[PDB]
Each structure stands twice: as C-alpha cells, then as structure tokens.
Amino acid sequence: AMRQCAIYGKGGIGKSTTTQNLVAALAEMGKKVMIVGCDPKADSTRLILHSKAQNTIMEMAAEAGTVEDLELEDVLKAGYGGVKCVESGGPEPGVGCAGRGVITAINFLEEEGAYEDDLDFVFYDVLGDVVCGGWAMPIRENKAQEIYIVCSGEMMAMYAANNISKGIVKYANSGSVRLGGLICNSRNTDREDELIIALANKLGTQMIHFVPRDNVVQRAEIRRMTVIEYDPKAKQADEYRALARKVVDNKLLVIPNPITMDELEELLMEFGIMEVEDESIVGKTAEEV
Amino acid sequence: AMRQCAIYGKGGIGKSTTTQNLVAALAEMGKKVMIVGCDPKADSTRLILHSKAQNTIMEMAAEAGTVEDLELEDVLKAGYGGVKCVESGGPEPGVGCAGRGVITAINFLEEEGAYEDDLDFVFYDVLGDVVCGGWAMPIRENKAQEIYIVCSGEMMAMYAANNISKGIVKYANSGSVRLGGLICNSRNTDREDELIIALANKLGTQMIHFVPRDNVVQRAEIRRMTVIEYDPKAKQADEYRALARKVVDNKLLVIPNPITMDELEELLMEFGIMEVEDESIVGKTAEEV
Ligand code: SF4
C-alpha cells in the first residue's frame, strides 16, 4: 500500500535537505520512494541526482508546447537508492497559480502510470508559508494524506506550521488529509526542542524528530548529496534513519488544533525567544525615556 | 498628482520596517501618505500607529459578513505624521487567492474615496518572493506604477528581486508598471552594497539606497515606532530621509532586464557570498576523498 505524504514548511529553514535525507535513509532501508518537488526553486531532487538543477515539468512543457507532449522518461529521473525524482517547476512569474502547476504535475504522473508502478512512498516537497488555496491544493485534491511540517524555534516557522495546520483543518471533512507530526530543523537556539514539543502538544500531534545542526550536512550537500550517501556512518546519518524509521512506523495521524497568535507568543515568551514587552515605553521617544 | 507605489520583496529581511521608516521620513518632509499593507502578517502599519496589530480588512469582513458592511473609519487609521494606515489581511489559510484578497481591499478603498482625498503617495507593502499571478495582481491591475524592491546580498532575496522584475516585464505592454530601484536592507555582509549595485546594473535599474544595520532601528521598533519619530536626529533617521528624498526625486522608472540563474551565481561568486564549486568531489563520499 503506497503512502502519499507531503512535507510542508516555509523557506530558508532547510526543508528540502531534510526531505531528501529522510527519503535517502528510507531507500537505504529498502523502500521504493518518489520525490515530487513542488517548491518554486527546483531544490527538492538535487541531492538525490547529484544535480545542479533538475528539469521541471514547467520548463519542459514550455519547450514542448503543452504538458502532454513530454515523455515520463524526461520528467522522472532516478538517483541514489533508485529514488525517483520529479520537479514540477514554480509558477511562471507574474502569471500562474502555484497550485495549478502542482496539480498539473500530479495528473501528468497519474496518467503516465508512475504511481501504479511499485512504490512504497510518495513525498511531495511543498512550500507552506502563505497557505493560500493554491499552496493548499495538494491537501484539497487529496494527493497527500500524511503531512509532516518542517519548522523550527523561530516565530515565522512556527506561524507557518500553524497555518499549514489550519489548512489541514479546512479539508478534514472532505477526506483523509491528516497531520503526521512536526520535524524540527534545529537552528541551535536554547529551548528549541522543548518549544517545538510544546507546540506539537497544543496542536494535538508530536514532534516526530529533532534534526540537529551538523556541519556534515553542509559538507554532504556541497557535493550535491545526502549525508546518508556521503558519510553513511556519521552521527547525522543515524538521525535521518531515526526519523525515517519513526515515519514508517507512524500511526499518529490527526486533525490538529490551531492556536491563536497570543498563544503562539506565550510559548515563544516562556521558552525565551520572545522578550516580554514593556507597555510603558510604547509610543514614547528617547526624550520621554 | 498622487504617485502609486509599491514595495516588493521577500520576508525576513526587514522590508516592512524600511517601508514604514521611509514613509515616516516622507511625512516629516510634508507629504500626505497612505500605507496599504498587503503581507499575510499585519506588520506594515504597526510602527506608524504604535500598534501591537492593526485590524485588517480580512478580519473585519469576517466579522461584518461581507466587505461592504464595514465603514472606512474602521479600516483607515491615522498615525504619526497623519500617515493613513490600512492593513488588508492575509489569505485565509487553506483557501483563497492572496492576490484577490488584496485587490478586493484596494477596491474597497476606491469606493470609499480614500485615494481621491488629498494624497501625495500610496505605498503598498507587498510580498515578493514567489511571484505567482496572485501576488503579481497590483502590477497587472495597474494599482501601483512605481515598484521598489527591498532585497539584500543573500541568494533568496536576490532571486526574489529578479522574480519581481520578471513580473513587471510580463505586464510592461499592458500599462505603466515600472521598476523604480532596489533598496538594500543590509545584513552587514562584506560586499553587499557593491553586489546590489551590480544586480541593479544587470537588471537595468539602480540601487536607490543602502539602509544599514543600526541598533536604533531595533530600539525604535520595540517601542512600536519608526526611527523618524523615536529619534529625529539619529544617524539612521537621515538615511531614511535620504531614501525618501531620492524616491521623490526619482525619474529612473524602467522595464527591467531579468538575469539567468547562472548570472545570479556569477554575481554572488565574484562578490564572495557563494563559493566556487569543485566539480571533482561531486557525488563522492568521504571515502573517495
Ligand atoms: S491562489 Fe495562491 S499560488 Fe495561486 S495565484 Fe493566488 S496567491 Fe498565487
């Protein structure tokens, strides 16, 4: 039974690297996996193919006229561990919906029989910042059931997590789209693990793993590869195996409970990211104080 | 003659603070200005109103049923220098186009006669990262003619600038939407000013100003106010006046020339942000090397 999963989360926090390393650990583990990149930047398959950039469905459709004109052998490319790799391409700037380009991509693969063909996992690496109806479309068209949110102990990455959660709550009644957990991509701030566990508890899910900051990640990715391929017996490689193992074994799939902005700030203030604001100096110049 | 302007740029680089300080410097200068916030986060008017958060059109429409049910006196709020302040509200998570929600807000103001009412400037603080058709709508529906891109000497902020430029190129023929320049929100990296000069040059525009990193920005914004109000004779306050003055005086309004990813990396490599990649170690493990 093929499990359709998605990795949602905002940019700049290392989401695609973690998606690729998790998927690599999962292929070393014997699983047949396909990565379908949905971020505007083509970064989701590079570490698997040792690529500078993969050719997207969007740019190859621009070349061949319409999407139907290209062959699957030009879209799907296998890399390390025989992990199949698709990159759908970003919205074409100024026009086009990010959501339409993503379902355009999904439907091409369905017809070309990429899903049917023996596969244990499908991972869509989707942008989850502003969860508009477009970036919410993999959830609405029920193309991904198990959503894992990459985030960190930072205000905007936590806010993005809560928005992705609100997205899932919106379509709870229409299907089987559920939140499988939070992955914390460490930024080495002090109470980060506890903070993301606290957020996961308010949301009704867990922190399925803490991925630490390790320089081997950078050493591996500068060679355009995952830590699993690069240095299989590193400390970090077992972190990715521990994440890959918990994902496989995961049964905690839920409808989350989104928190308010005040509650997001309570959690940030008590774990020391946010300072408590002093009411008395608001609106007052350096003259008054 | 009212000049309709927009500040485009990605998140996390201090865009809204610079928009607000520029607009404050412009009001000290005698101009009548309105800030219309278009980012999902309501941060665009807070420093002008000494607000924790302004009530958005989106949330007040949710309260009153439809957008027509609310009065302009509840949407537009005046702050420092009598700067009028609107916050349109983000896309409601999981649903809607972010672009449709933004132009719905602009149309509310048009009918309520906020533009007509003596105004020298209109500044829309818009998100410019993924320039999908939604976030490109102020450009397409020609609600803003002079677009200034906030960016910095960082890969994703430069990529975002080039995408906003491609957005403008798309609608060049349909109207008067032009690129007025790049504002660099300094991250204190070494060759940053020269890099954004060079980016602006490849793009066919200028770097209209360099906004440095100064602790007075943080001291002022923690009081929920602009450096212009907080300390009228700070070094930074004159930076904002210098930017405000060049904007007023600006005649450089161009259809930009977007660069390739390779060219974006040439510029980042020669200014020392990007390291040169060594081909020989790609795909090779720690065993080979
Ligand atoms: S729905 Fe979202 S991705 Fe699509 S055009 Fe609108 S803002 Fe863009």
Cα-based distances in Å from B289 to A219, B31, B282, B284: 12, 63, 10, 7
Assign residue B198 the CATH number of its domain. Answer: 3.40.50.300
- Asked if A130 reaches chain B (Cβ–Cβ under 8 Å), the answer is yes
Cα-based distances in Å from B256 to A93, B156, B164, B169, B182: 14, 18, 10, 7, 11
Q: How many CB atoms lie within 10 A of CB A118?
A: 7
Side-by-side strand order, sheet with B207-211 = B77-78, B84-87, B33-37, B121-127, B3-9, B146-151, B178-185, B207-211
| Method in brief | X-ray
List the beta strands (DSSP E) in A13-120. 33-37, 77-78, 84-87
Q: How many CB atoms lie within 10 A of CB A186?
A: 17
DSSP annotation of B276 reads P
Q: How far is the CA of A227 from the centre of ligand 1 (A)?
A: 34
Cα-based distances in Å from B66 to A25, B204, B260: 50, 43, 44
From A58, A129, A135, give the residue whose CB has the most ligand 1 atoms within 8 Å, as the site to mutate. Answer: A135
Q: How many CA atoms lie within 13 A of B175 on its CB side?
A: 17
The angle at the Cα of A271, spanning A265 to A272, to the nearest 5 degrees, equals 85
Count up the domains in chain B and report the number: 1
Cα-based distances in Å from B99 to A29, A220, A284, B84, B106: 44, 39, 36, 22, 11
- Asked if B20 and B35 touch (Cβ cutoff 8 Å), the reply is yes
Q: Which of B223, B274, B280 to mutate to test the interface with A (most CBs of A within 10 A)?
A: B223
- Amino acid identity of B98? A
The angle at the Cα of B49, spanning B24 to A283, to the nearest 5 degrees, equals 90
Cα-based distances in Å from A281 to A262, A269, A273: 20, 19, 20
DSSP annotation of A254 reads B
- Amino acid identity of B110? E
Structure tokens at B70: 């609310």
**Alpha carbons A192 and B184: distance in angstroms, whole number:** 31
Q: Among candidates A1, A24, A15, which has minimal Cα distance to A151?
A: A15
Cα-based distances in Å from A61 to A37, A74, A138, B171, B266: 16, 11, 20, 22, 27
Nearest-CA residue for atom 4 of ligand 1? A97
* In chain A, residues 1-30 whose CB comes closer than 8 Å to chain B: 11-12
CB < 8 Å & 24+ apart, contacts of A276-280: A277/B222
Which ligand 1 atom lies nearest to the CA of residue B133? Answer: 5
DSSP annotation of B202 reads H
Task: Write out the residue range of the structural domain in which residue A49 sits.
Answer: 1-289
CB < 8 Å & 24+ apart, contacts of A194-202: A194/A271, A195/A153, A195/A267, A195/A268, A195/A271, A195/A273, A196/A151, A196/A152, A196/A153, A196/A158, A198/A267, A198/A271, A199/A151, A199/A158, A199/A161, A199/A162, A199/A259, A199/A267, A202/A257, A202/A259, A202/A263, A202/A267
In the block, tokens 């450096």 appear at B227
Question: Contacts of residue A163 in chain B, CB cutoff 8 Å?
Answer: 93
Ligand 1 neighbourhood includes A132 CB (under 6 angstroms): yes
Side-by-side strand order, sheet with A3-9 = A77-78, A84-87, A33-37, A121-127, A3-9, A146-151, A178-185, A207-211
